[PDB]
Design a protein around this ligand. Structure first.
Ligand SMILES: [Ca+2]
Ligand SMILES: [Ca+2]
Ligand SMILES: [Ca+2]
Lengths: 167, 151
């Protein structure tokens, strides 16, 4: 019944499950070194947040530089665990990698919405694609209220209102 | 692995980042070359604070020349010897006779430096040293005298 400590806070991803990983240990927020970052290592971090399995594991903190101190280094893991700290660790707190080597992980569901035409990858009129489990798919036609379209246009940032073209 | 910042007075005052156990082979050990590179000893002197000045290079001993030899070079030589600065510079060869091979090195030193190897040395192309003009020194022996800007 606590907020607890050491929760893998994912930020800069734009969703609930994406971006860099941050850990609040000994009262300090910190990133994770990318030394020998493994996809099997990315499986546990996704499971702890309840997101699911892992799709990609990215290094060099391309999601974003982490200002905080580096906490763990050279983490490898069996991939089947519930507590992140219980992963094969070369010690604690001491790192051979500096910042710009922070780790990033994409979990099972980081959904992205795009408006696509043949000419433009992102345009303001076209088809509706949804990102799920590292894949792109069309959206259903049946039972679309005017409010349903209204939200899609607002999220994509094209217009306040929108309309369905039959063509 | 050392991580010294550069201004440490000693190596023991250095942040050390110890990698886990594991080493390279013995063939990859390192060696450093500091700039002192010169050995000066007083020879044929009745007391330790004075003697004929010799420097060793190319695996041989030879005496310095009084030509282009001034008082401050004796002073900094004394400071290295820790006898205290030379009260007076001896003239001629009153106690230096030997080592017919004479190095022509002449030392241009301001005297502020503490070790005579530090002050710049130019010797390439120097003219031949006349005989009996071998340099020397007569240090104070007080050990309580220090150089001062301007006896
Ligand atoms: Ca790295
Ligand atoms: Ca690993
Ligand atoms: Ca390392």
């Amino acid at each position: 019944a606590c907020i607890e400590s050491g929760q893998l806070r994912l930020v800069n991803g734009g969703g609930r499950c994406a971006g860099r990983v941050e850990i609040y240990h000994e009262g300090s927020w910190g990133t994770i070194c990318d030394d020998s970052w493994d996809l099997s290592d990315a499986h546990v971090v996704c499971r702890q947040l309840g997101c699911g399995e892992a799709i990609n594991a990215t290094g060099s903190a391309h999601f974003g530089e982490g200002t905080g101190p580096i906490w763990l280094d050279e983490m490898k893991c069996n991939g089947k665990e519930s507590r992140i700290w219980q992963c094969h660790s070369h010690g604690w707190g001491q790192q051979n990698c500096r910042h710009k080597e922070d780790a990033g992980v994409i979990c099972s569901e980081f959904m992205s919405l795009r408006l696509t035409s043949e000419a433009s990858r992102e345009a303001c009129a076209g088809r509706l694609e949804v990102f799920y489990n590292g894949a792109w798919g069309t959206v259903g036609k049946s039972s679309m209220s005017e409010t349903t379209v209204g939200v899609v246009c607002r999220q994509l940032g094209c217009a306040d209102k929108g309309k369905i073209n039959p063509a | 692995e050392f991580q010294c910042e550069g201004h440490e007075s000693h190596l023991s005052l250095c942040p050390v980042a110890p990698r886990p156990e594991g080493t390279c082979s013995h063939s990859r050990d390192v060696g450093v070359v500091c700039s002192r590179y010169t050995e000066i000893r007083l020879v044929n002197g009745k007391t330790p604070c004075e003697g004929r000045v010799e420097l060793k290079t190319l695996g041989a001993w030879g005496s310095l020349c009084n030509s282009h030899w001034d008082i401050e070079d004796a002073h900094v030589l004394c400071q290295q010897l820790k006898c205290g600065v030379a009260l007076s510079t001896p003239g001629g060869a009153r106690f230096g006779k030997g080592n017919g091979q004479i190095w022509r090195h002449m030392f241009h030193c301001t005297g502020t430096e503490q070790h005579m190897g530090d002050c710049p040395v130019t010797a390439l192309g120097a003219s031949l040293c006349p005989s009996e003009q071998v340099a020397s020194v007569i240090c104070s022996g007080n050990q309580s005298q220090t150089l001062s800007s301007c006896v």
